[PDB]
Swiss-Prot record, chains A, B:
Performs an essential function in the generation of cytoplasmic iron-sulfur proteins by mediating the ATP-dependent export of Fe/S cluster precursors synthesized by NFS1 and other mitochondrial proteins. Hydrolyzes ATP. Binds glutathione and may function by transporting a glutathione-conjugated iron-sulfur compound. It is an enzyme of class 7 (translocase). Changing R119Q: Decreases ATP hydrolysis. Decreases transporter activity. The gene is ATM1. ATP binds at Y348, G372, S373, S374, G375, S376, G377, K378, S379, T380, I381, L382, K383. CDD domains: ABC_6TM_ATM1_ABCB7 (cd18582), ABCC_ATM1_transporter (cd03253). It comes from Saccharomyces cerevisiae (strain ATCC 204508 / S288c) (Baker's yeast). The chain crosses the membrane at residues 14-35, 59-82, 132-155, 157-177, 244-262, 278-299. InterPro entries: AAA+_ATPase, ABC1_TM_dom, ABC1_TM_sf, ABC_transporter-like_ATP-bd, ABC_transporter-like_CS, P-loop_NTPase, Type_1_exporter. Its EC number is 7.-.-.-. This is Iron-sulfur clusters transporter ATM1, mitochondrial.
């Protein structure tokens, strides 16, 4: 577990904290001596009431202060150092988890709830500032000080005292915890009712019409008042239990202290103890009560943080499935790449075979389209080319070589993707376009936004390039979004290009515009382009069309040749698809007639 | 004016805490006397060291305990009593806020963001338990004790002491706040960056594919590390400045205390002051340090909670626009209700009129339907009849009386609504059906669930009637929901009945089933039914059809007679509606073909 330190001088700082820790408590126990000695050093003659104060004691009362102040300053300095340790561990862990997170496989990321992960990794770091704080700011200081104090008690007043001091500390613990763990049975009940009343008031605000259309209002009001009164009663039991907790804690010390001052007064009669000795055993034992109040909030905290920190550790336990083998190839530099599928059988889970023994070629320089109705399996080409997944049977070759043997990072570099639904980042657009390639000159970025015909957006946008998009920002049209994606893939300048269903922008008028801006930028310039559509009309000018059916390659040719082929599937698809376009275009037209008055 | 006093004898409870407060600092200040007395009364002979302890002082050390414990015990009790005051005010405010909110008009409820209201009142109560605690648990107790201690000092030790005690108090405050206000610019910066890292890591996990489809990864890891180091470097400055604060605060009391032991020891030379008196001025002035360390978390809270208490109060400021006049009519008793529109002009925002000078009669007992294409203004009939809004020009009468003169509750009680989208409540269905009329017998609720043909749903449902429906529960189909809304209006048994676009259940077979269930329960039984439809096909059996266009009543008659009327608008609407239904029926057929892998 743990092990934030390995080979460095951060442990230098760690010793320093401990020195400042030890040396802050020494200065603390030293304070009451200076109070006792100063008391005794005044229990004398003074029949000349005009004498100045002996410096011999003037010094001793400075000592009091510069030991009182000394104790705190070294405790603060202990803290300020160790934070430079703590904040360092969190920064280092939060990154290595993130970094290892993306080295993880796609199948993994898809099962995992992204929020279950964002919490797990955040609440993972909280559980470190919870557990390193528990030790260094509380337990170790309270361990040393209690050790030292009972030590001195044995030594200077007798184990008679030390016995009851340490005993009281233990009684304090095994009352604080046995009460505190008990008293969560209220907060977990208070914020319960708080939520009950929270939900009643919310329905009553959303469904405002619904309560209006009926009687009620009063029904929901004293339904609220019901939940409100449950919560009042519950919070009342919290404030009350707290009183009991604080009174029980004080009664422990007050008697512990009171009974000792008795014990001290016998030693003043027995002549063994001075009068300062009374102040000493009082103020000595009292100085332990202060930090003892904190270490009662914890216990559960230490329980919850023990696991919440492991769950964050457990993440990096996860194994990487898709890795490049030993002696991995980079390979070809300046040739156009072709793609071939040899008997590829693949799906997610052996129950679902999606690609059933698929074989075909995607030649270099060409525009190849891959079409098929619902269930075809075109839906999984790119993912296999990008080795996101690996095929269960059969293999996939680029330029005669299996891509398994290629360097998995090298491969992915030459492939550009315009995805069906583009992601935006909570950032500037100018930072979203630049996402294509980081080292882009400002000039490159403008041209690419120009080439894509994204200009009208930034002009229409008041805050221009600096406008914030993302879920937490300004939302833009699908068209402007897909336009941005074209922009990105222009910057990346890949050799192989995928357009995975690029134009399911649910507006035909907008699809037209996008398909043109694409036919301008990606025309046969020794880029090998794969188009994956289900609207064949948008890929009719392809150099090769591969049509899949229930996971297997049925036909394979050009548009005009596939259409003319007797008994072709393409013609069935072209026909329904086209009959459909006329229909939903015709239906849109009539919705319009009914859309406005007459 | 949080008004802890009003008209009840809860102000008796209020005094007790204050009493418990007053009698708790007294028990506190006496503790150094009993410690002093015990010191002086032991500074004597004892030349017989076998004597038992004199009771005169055994009592003096008892007095110490039962004053130390008593002081706290009264402070705990002051708090547990006063919670029973605080918690009560929140409840009282939480209800009248809730109650008055529903007296507000639909337009108000529609503009205000509903979560903003839920935050406002949740954050509203925080600012009361914060300002009631700040007063009774801190400011007053520490003001009272400072006075008492400064009283004692001037009285028994001279203004010499009081001068520097009180000065230390001010020096303490007007440093802490002046420091704390400075040091907030770090937590407001740490959690700033923490949110930056938050969004980075989140974006890199949702758009995990995008970062994979591109270069980057490394780009995003050290975009995180930037924020991570922004946060680390920020969090240290939090710990560093905190150390300064606690050190700076400790310096203040340490010199103040030390300097007084000087000033005290000189009064021991002058024979004026005993040695216990050294303990006395120390511990008295020390016992003022304890609660002062908390009272530094405030000042800003006192500001933030002051406005968060004011915005929550600003709510009841809001004017109720739709209110009944003085001496409002209830009226007609056992007659069927009719509805008539006299020159009604209405819109939201006076510039954009929806209903333009509409006049028509909705005769009693009949089934009246109101149809029209978009812009018609049928879209706003119900809202006006329910006095949600009031017409700009013209009036609306039920049985000859302007509905403005009716008791707005009396009016709304006789109108039942089956809305286009029924709302669900987070509760059982049985409680959602019973919502129609609360005082319904359990049997009544059964007959209604039967009549509505809702029975099949509760049988199909796992936990039967007790099943939890709602957003944070189990969602049911539109058809089942509209089936439940029909149920509710049966329990209500209203005299006037509106079916606002009830069956735009985007599933036709389910529409047909519903219309049958409606036509069975609502047959002219001295109930006057108004249907607002846009598929005229569903209201052809009406007794009167009123057709609106661009806000004005164009034609008005029966189904067959309107159809036959030459140049009628109804035949035009009938025609578009007919073709439209025919198209989307054909389009349903064609999508199915492409929907399957054959
Ligand atoms: N001396 C106090 C510090 C009081 C204080 O201002 N604490 C900060 C920590 S930086 C805080 O967040 N207080 C609550 C707030 O101001 O919202 C303590 O350490 O217990």
């Amino acid at each position: 577990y743990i092990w934030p330190k390995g080979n460095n001088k951060v442990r230098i700082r760690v010793l320093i904290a401990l020195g400042l820790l030890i040396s802050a408590k020494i200065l603390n126990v030293q304070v009451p001596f200076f109070f006792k000695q100063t008391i005794d050093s005044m229990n004398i003659a003074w029949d000349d009431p005009t004498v100045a104060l002996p410096a011999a004691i003037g010094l001793t009362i400075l000592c009091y202060g510069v030991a009182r102040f000394g104790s705190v300053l070294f405790g603060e300095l202990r803290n300020a150092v160790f934070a430079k340790v703590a904040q360092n561990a969190i920064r280092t862990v939060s990154l290595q988890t993130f970094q290892h997170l993306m080295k993880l496989d796609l199948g993994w990321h898809l099962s995992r709830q992204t929020g279950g992960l964002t919490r797990a990794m955040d609440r993972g770091t909280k559980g470190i500032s919870q557990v390193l704080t528990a030790m260094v700011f509380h337990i170790i200081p309270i361990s040393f000080e209690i050790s030292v104090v009972c030590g001195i008690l044995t030594y200077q007043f007798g184990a008679s005292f030390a016995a009851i001091t340490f005993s009281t500390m233990l009684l304090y613990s095994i009352f604080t915890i046995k009460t505190t763990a008990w008293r969560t049975h209220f907060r977990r009940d208070a914020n319960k009712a708080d939520n009950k009343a929270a939900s009643v008031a919310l329905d009553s605000l959303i469904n405002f019409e619904a309560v209006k259309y009926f009687n009620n209002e009063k029904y929901l009001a004293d339904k609220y008042n019901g939940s409100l009164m449950n919560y009042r009663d519950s919070q009342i039991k919290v404030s009350q239990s707290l009183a009991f907790l604080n009174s029980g804690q004080n009664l422990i010390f007050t008697t512990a202290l009171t009974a000792m001052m008795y014990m001290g007064c016998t030693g003043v009669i027995g002549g063994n103890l001075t009068v300062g000795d009374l102040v000493l055993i009082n103020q000595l034992v009292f100085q332990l009560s202060v930090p003892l109040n904190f270490l009662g909030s914890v216990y559960r905290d230490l329980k919850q943080s023990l696991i919440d920190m492991e769950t964050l550790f457990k993440l990096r336990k996860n194994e990487v499935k898709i890795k490049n083998a030993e002696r991995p190839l980079m390979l070809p530099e300046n040739v156009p790449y072709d793609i071939t599928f040899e008997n590829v059988t693949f799906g997610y889970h052996p129950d679902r075979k999606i690609l059933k023994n698929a074989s075909f070629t995607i030649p270099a320089g060409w525009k190849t389209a891959i079409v098929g109705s619902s269930g075809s399996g075109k839906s999984t080409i790119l993912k296999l080319v990008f080795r996101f997944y690996d095929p269960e049977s059969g293999r996939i070759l680029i330029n005669g070589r299996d891509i398994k043997e290629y360097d998995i990072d090298a491969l992915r570099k030459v492939i550009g993707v315009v995805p069906q639904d583009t992601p935006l980042f909570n950032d500037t657009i100018w930072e979203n376009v630049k996402f294509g390639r980081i080292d882009a000159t400002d000039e490159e970025v403008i041209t690419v936004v120009e080439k894509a015909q994204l200009a009208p957006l930034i002009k229409k946008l008041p805050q221009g390039f600096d406008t914030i998009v993302g879920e937490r920002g300004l939302m833009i049209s699908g068209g402007e979004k897909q336009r941005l994606a074209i922009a990105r893939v222009l910057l990346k300048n890949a050799r192989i290009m995928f357009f995975d269903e690029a134009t399911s922008a649910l507006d035909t008028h907008t699809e037209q515009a996008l398909l043109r801006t694409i036919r301008d930028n990606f025309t046969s310039g020794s880029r090998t382009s794969v188009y994956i559509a289900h609207r064949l009309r948008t890929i009719a000018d392809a150099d090769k069309i591969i049509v899949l059916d229930n996971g297997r390659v049925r036909e394979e040719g050009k548009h005009l040749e596939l259409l003319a082929m007797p008994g072709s599937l393409y013609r069935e698809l072209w026909t329904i698809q086209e009959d459909l376009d006329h229909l939903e275009n015709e239906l849109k037209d009539q919705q319009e007639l009914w859309s406005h008055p007459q």
